[PDB]
Scaffold this active site. Structure first.
Site, mmCIF file in Angstrom:
data_model
loop_
_atom_site.group_PDB
_atom_site.id
_atom_site.type_symbol
_atom_site.label_atom_id
_atom_site.label_comp_id
_atom_site.label_asym_id
_atom_site.label_seq_id
_atom_site.Cartn_x
_atom_site.Cartn_y
_atom_site.Cartn_z
ATOM 1 N N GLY A 5 0.810 -1.194 0.000
ATOM 2 C CA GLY A 5 0.000 0.000 0.000
ATOM 3 C C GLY A 5 0.850 1.252 0.000
ATOM 4 O O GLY A 5 2.081 1.204 0.017
ATOM 5 N N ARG A 6 0.163 2.391 -0.010
ATOM 6 C CA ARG A 6 0.824 3.675 0.086
ATOM 7 C C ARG A 6 -0.090 4.599 0.869
ATOM 8 O O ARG A 6 -1.272 4.311 1.061
ATOM 9 C CB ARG A 6 1.152 4.237 -1.298
ATOM 10 C CG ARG A 6 -0.036 4.575 -2.098
ATOM 11 C CD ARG A 6 0.405 4.870 -3.495
ATOM 12 N NE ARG A 6 0.134 3.707 -4.328
ATOM 13 C CZ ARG A 6 0.096 3.725 -5.653
ATOM 14 N NH1 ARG A 6 0.514 4.775 -6.343
ATOM 15 N NH2 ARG A 6 -0.380 2.665 -6.298
ATOM 16 N N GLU A 25 6.607 12.696 10.958
ATOM 17 C CA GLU A 25 6.876 11.602 11.881
ATOM 18 C C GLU A 25 7.846 12.033 12.967
ATOM 19 O O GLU A 25 8.818 12.747 12.704
ATOM 20 C CB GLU A 25 7.539 10.445 11.136
ATOM 21 C CG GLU A 25 6.676 9.862 10.044
ATOM 22 C CD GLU A 25 7.376 8.806 9.222
ATOM 23 O OE1 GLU A 25 8.561 8.506 9.482
ATOM 24 O OE2 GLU A 25 6.711 8.273 8.321
ATOM 25 N N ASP A 67 2.902 -2.124 16.825
ATOM 26 C CA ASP A 67 3.777 -1.483 15.841
ATOM 27 C C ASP A 67 4.331 -0.163 16.357
ATOM 28 O O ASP A 67 4.540 0.778 15.586
ATOM 29 C CB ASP A 67 3.058 -1.274 14.503
ATOM 30 C CG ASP A 67 4.005 -1.269 13.302
ATOM 31 O OD1 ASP A 67 5.167 -1.698 13.437
ATOM 32 O OD2 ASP A 67 3.590 -0.809 12.228
ATOM 33 N N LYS A 102 6.867 2.482 17.058
ATOM 34 C CA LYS A 102 8.175 2.885 16.555
ATOM 35 C C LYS A 102 8.059 4.350 16.180
ATOM 36 O O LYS A 102 6.953 4.824 15.975
ATOM 37 C CB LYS A 102 8.602 2.055 15.330
ATOM 38 C CG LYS A 102 7.615 2.039 14.192
ATOM 39 C CD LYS A 102 8.053 1.083 13.092
ATOM 40 C CE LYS A 102 7.074 1.103 11.950
ATOM 41 N NZ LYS A 102 7.657 0.349 10.812
ATOM 42 N N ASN A 112 5.757 5.787 13.362
ATOM 43 C CA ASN A 112 4.314 5.716 13.464
ATOM 44 C C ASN A 112 3.728 6.766 14.393
ATOM 45 O O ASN A 112 2.526 6.732 14.672
ATOM 46 C CB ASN A 112 3.863 4.311 13.866
ATOM 47 C CG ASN A 112 3.951 3.349 12.743
ATOM 48 O OD1 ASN A 112 4.045 3.753 11.583
ATOM 49 N ND2 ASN A 112 3.793 2.068 13.063
ATOM 50 N N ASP A 169 -1.053 4.025 11.747
ATOM 51 C CA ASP A 169 -0.737 2.679 11.277
ATOM 52 C C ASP A 169 -1.194 1.622 12.267
ATOM 53 O O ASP A 169 -0.445 1.183 13.148
ATOM 54 C CB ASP A 169 0.736 2.505 10.875
ATOM 55 C CG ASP A 169 0.946 1.266 10.019
ATOM 56 O OD1 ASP A 169 0.011 0.422 9.948
ATOM 57 O OD2 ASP A 169 2.030 1.157 9.390
ATOM 58 N N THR A 182 8.550 -4.339 13.794
ATOM 59 C CA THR A 182 9.869 -4.005 13.289
ATOM 60 C C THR A 182 10.938 -4.586 14.212
ATOM 61 O O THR A 182 10.802 -4.500 15.441
ATOM 62 C CB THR A 182 9.985 -2.486 13.225
ATOM 63 O OG1 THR A 182 9.020 -2.004 12.292
ATOM 64 C CG2 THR A 182 11.331 -2.047 12.763
#
Ligand SMILES: Cc1ccc(S(=O)(=O)N[C@@H]2CO[C@H](CO)[C@H]2O)cc1
Ligand SMILES: Cc1ccc(S(=O)(=O)N[C@@H]2CO[C@H](CO)[C@H]2O)cc1
Length: 339
Positions: free
Chosen positions: A44-45, A116, A155, A157, A160, A173, A190
């Protein structure tokens, strides 16, 4: 604490109502203009888009159904949308619309122009302890909220964690988030942020999020993560050893908190003991934090990102601009019926 218990009870009631009856099909692609690619991935994007009638900007996550299937992400993408449409918390990016077409799945989220945390952290080098503590408090409250709904985030990190116009965090996310009563088994996340019980293929629980918080706080305060190595296999060996080295500039309180979050034995890890999140909130490293003021966004942020307006993309990176096409034929309709 009754006020907090009642807040979480209401939060769960409201989550469950939306969880049981998810919204679907609340916009369509030709209602938007495409502006810029903000991020990519294997299936995806994320695009900056503008709604053509209101002029509002959004971050639209576009998932190619055929690639989701091939990369075995069906359940995860259904989790992501079902959870996002049901949650509501000050530090979570809001899902405004979702829909699908012959080719893709779409999640239209609020656009957070400040970028971010990852970018700001790498630009500055490391955050001071007060600065890391401000962000960490938001994650603690967010995980208290999610975990009370039986959700594991999986997730955490710096990439995100988006910084908003007030300098507060918005978590984005939810591709690995899952409603879990008990344990779950999927290998995801990750490498630098994975708890030992994930690496060891165990049934794991919400304690993995508290481990990841330890990694995040360490990385914010040091500028690099605690188990850094060149390849995943070497990272994993360091994680399961749990040997950490703290920079001398870390305060004693920070080291103590991190030893308890980065506890290899999940049954001894802060966040996962009898007192739950309160072992974290009451830790000396958080002694200066007013948890209510943070929740109410009444604390002045350490840092306000520089941006010109709600459409500015300067805090995000440049990607090759590729077509977003919609097939004349429906792909993978059965797999995504509930989306
Ligand atoms: C006296 C004092 C005040 C604040 C702190 S603090 O822990 O809040 N910040 C530390 C000082 O500068 C470094 C980077 O933040 C930290 O070791 C420690 C000691
Ligand atoms: C999840 C959550 C818990 C408590 C609060 S709180 O504002 O009551 N403070 C602690 C806000 C949010």
């Amino acid at each position: 604490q009754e006020s907090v218990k009642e807040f979480l009870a209401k939060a769960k009631e409201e989550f469950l109502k939306k969880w049981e009856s998810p919204s679907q099909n609340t916009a369509q692609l030709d209602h938007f203009d495409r502006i810029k690619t903000l991020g990519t991935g294997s299936f995806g994007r994320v695009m900056l888009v503008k709604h053509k009638e209101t002029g509002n900007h959004y971050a639209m996550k576009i998932l190619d159904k055929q690639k989701v299937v091939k990369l075995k992400q069906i359940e995860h993408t259904l989790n992501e949308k079902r959870i996002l449409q049901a949650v509501n918390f000050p530090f979570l990016v809001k899902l405004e619309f979702s829909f699908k077409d012959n080719s893709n799945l779409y999640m239209v989220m609020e656009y957070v122009p400040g970028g971010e945390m990852f970018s700001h952290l790498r630009r500055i080098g490391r955050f001071s302890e007060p600065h890391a503590r401000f962000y960490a408090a938001q994650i603690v409250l967010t995980f208290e909220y999610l975990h009370s709904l039986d959700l594991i985030y999986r997730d955490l990190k710096p990439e995100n964690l988006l910084i908003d116009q007030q300098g507060y965090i918005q978590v984005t996310d939810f591709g690995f988030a899952k409603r879990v009563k008990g344990r779950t088994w999927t290998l995801c996340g990750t490498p630098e942020y994975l708890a030992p019980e994930i690496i060891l293929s165990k049934g794991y629980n919400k304690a993995v999020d508290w481990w990841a918080l330890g990694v995040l706080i360490y990385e914010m305060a040091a500028g690099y993560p605690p188990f850094f190595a060149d390849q995943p296999i070497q990272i994993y060996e360091k994680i399961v050893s749990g040997k950490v080295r703290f920079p001398s500039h870390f305060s004693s309180d920070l080291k103590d908190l991190l030893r308890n979050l980065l506890q290899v034995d999940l049954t001894k890890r802060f966040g996962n003991l009898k007192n739950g999140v309160n072992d974290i909130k009451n830790h000396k490293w958080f002694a200066t934090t007013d948890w209510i003021a943070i929740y109410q966004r009444k604390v002045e942020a350490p840092f306000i990102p520089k941006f010109k307006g709600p459409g500015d993309t300067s805090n995000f990176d440049d990607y090759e601009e590729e077509e977003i096409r919609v097939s004349i034929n429906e792909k993978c309709g059965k797999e995504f019926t509930e989306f």
